[model samples]
Target: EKLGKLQYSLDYDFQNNQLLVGIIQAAELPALDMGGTSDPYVKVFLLPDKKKKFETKVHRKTLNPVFNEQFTFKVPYSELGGKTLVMAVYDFDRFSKHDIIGEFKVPMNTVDFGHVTEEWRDLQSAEK
Candidate 1:
């Protein structure tokens, strides 16, 4: 079976010098906890540089989580070509390090920043 899927949106605010990311939800995620569910959350990063990152709040005991969270990154118009957007989903653990479920990356150059784009992207394994 596939790892699962993530629903998200992206938009660039040229006037404000910002990149806005919307984390809508996730579905059909694999169970990571012994109780047959996972406490899931997602981390957002503008790659090639991990200096700034954002994360969603954890949804407890669920295989499907409704995040509905938005994050904004300060980016310049000239820097869009070198940036990549990465969304990493993880199973949150209280006592130990979180377990990475899967992730997907979108190179900024591939998208048109003129309007908001929303999509349901399939999760891919982290195996390069």
Candidate 2:
């Protein structure tokens, strides 16, 4: 099945050498008909090199909330490089602690943009 596009915005704090990303409704918005929040999580992998397979996610506080609410994920550049970034988000249930909503995988290096929203771009550049 297909969730929504789940557009994301990335911004990194170079001073601390950390990355921050935000997940929002994408082009093909999902059919959201409930209330609460969505706990988003991304599984980053340096493709063709499974050894770098790792997962990073936002705090479980976000729920059926709107995309307006910002959720942040911090990843070190050391763990990111010459690789692809694949991410997915799920509506979380505190009790079950399971995904109950939207989810999607971003193309590897899809965020490898040279302009704004670059941080959203693969390796770096959260210009968006």
Candidate 3:
């Protein structure tokens, strides 16, 4: 609910100068229609200038939210420079219904994981 931004960061390494784009665990759940399930699908809008994007054919469940699940969206060192990356989670079931559930955003130009440890590191890896 924090401004609903598609913003996030990859830790910039000073030594290697190579940012590692890791895979976020994708949610695993069976589909159901009894009104207790989450249809999880990550939609990425990468480099609007280039118009590059694709949706994962996989999905997640609801009723029981799993934070340990994730998928990967790689922004290479070259493609990321001076470009914008818009990532979001859409209503797997309702995207066609024009309804959204949860989402996040990030920039390829202005973020360093080292500086924002609390926001990027702590939150994602935290357990309730």
Candidate 4:
């Protein structure tokens, strides 16, 4: 099944050299378990620095999960333009390894660092 989309916002703090992420919500996510639902969560990261990852809390058994969680990446604003922002959606499984439903990437180069921007990103197959 094709996963849905992730809605989020981005902003930068020039003074603090930080990138702020707001995980607003996800829509029409696929159910992966026999129970007819998925415990969905998100992992956010900045490439080239995989040492740290920010995540949202899992929403239990719902097609549309509302996160509204905030995260921050403490990197120089000047260097952010070349980095890739990764947002991966997964089915959280406590008993075993988590399953990836889909994901998308936002290239910071396209984002106007001078203002806050929000967008609905379409999820693609993990293989892609």
Candidate 5:
């Protein structure tokens, strides 16, 4: 449910000045399937770029999945300063629509990305 924790890290290349990257390492999910298991994956995005998205390969039939997936964005730090990091966990179905288990948004401005950018975040309702 909303109590799952997603762990990740973030970094920026000041040298490149307009590049940012991060990893959506793993997630501990609650059961979302009737069989007491779920096939899950994560969808990540930098808000304001809602039309653009990235996702990890599906992890089949597991409540805990390791993504270690990295994503990069081409934008200036100033542009990212006020943006938010959005992540959603989904139960993937091979022949049907993916069901969103939970999601959360974190304002990147509150995080220190220059160093020690790793963090564990509790997923919240997408309604917010």
Candidate 6:
């Protein structure tokens, strides 16, 4: 099944040594629950090291969720190139483990941090 897409934004505050991530929303996600909707949330990580991570609050009973949440990562500008931002969307389950809906990765080096960037990207399968 084709997972939908995520909309987000990223901004780097060079002077403050912080990376601001905005989780805007997700759309057209597959229903993974019996109710024909999903309890979804997003987990973010600056990978190569998962010591620090962030998660958005779960939105219940909807295929499309608007997160409108922000998270910050304290990292030096010099180290940005060596990092990758991974956003994984998951379906929350109360009695069982959460299921990953899909994910997308952005290599830090590929972004021009001079300005904030926002875009929608399609989700990819979890299998490596």
Q: Give all candidates' CA lDDT scores.
A: 0.87, 0.42, 0.44, 0.86, 0.73, 0.88
Residue-wise C-alpha lDDT for candidate 4, range 1-128, written one tens digit per residue: 75799999899988768889999999988887898888989999988776469878888888789999988888886678888899998898898878787999888988887788988999887852
Which candidate ranks first by lDDT, i.e. highest? Answer: 6
Cα TM-score per model? 0.94, 0.41, 0.48, 0.93, 0.85, 0.94
Q: lDDT tens digits, residues 53-79, model 6?
A: 888898889988999998888888888
Candidates 1 and 5 compared by lDDT, better number:
1
Q: Per-residue lDDT for 1-128 in model 1, tens only?
A: 44899999999988888888999999999877788888989989888987578889999998888999898888797886689899999888889878878899998899887899899998886642
Q: On a 0 to 1 TM-score scale, where does candidate 1 land against the true structure?
A: 0.94
Q: After superposition, how far is residue 17 of candidate 1 from its true place, in Å?
A: 1.3
Q: Which scores greater on TM-score, model 1 or model 6?
A: 6
Shift in Å, residue 5, candidate 1? 0.7
Off by over 4 Å in 4: none
Q: What does candidate 2's lDDT look like per residue over 1-128, in tens digits?
A: 23344456755465666545555433322332255334544443334445444444454444322353343334565554444445444443446645434333444244543333633222121111
Q: Model 5 over residues 22-94: C-alpha lDDT tens digits?
A: 5555455767668888787888888876645887888898877888877777777888888888888788877
Q: Quick one: how many clashes does candidate 5 have?
A: 0
Q: Candidate 3's error at 10, in angstroms?
A: 4.1
Q: What order do candidates take by TM-score, descending?
A: 6, 1, 4, 5, 3, 2
Q: Which stretches of candidate 2 lie over 4 Å from their true place?
A: 1-3, 26-65, 82-87, 91-102, 107-110, 113-128
Cα distance off (Å), candidate 5, residue 70: 1.2
Candidate 3 structure quality by residue, lDDT tens digits, 1-128: 22122223345454555443332433333333457565655565655563545564445555223233323344456666676545455546554462354444456666644643223321121111
Question: Against the true structure, candidate 2 has what lDDT?
Answer: 0.42
Cα lDDT over the full model 1 = 0.87
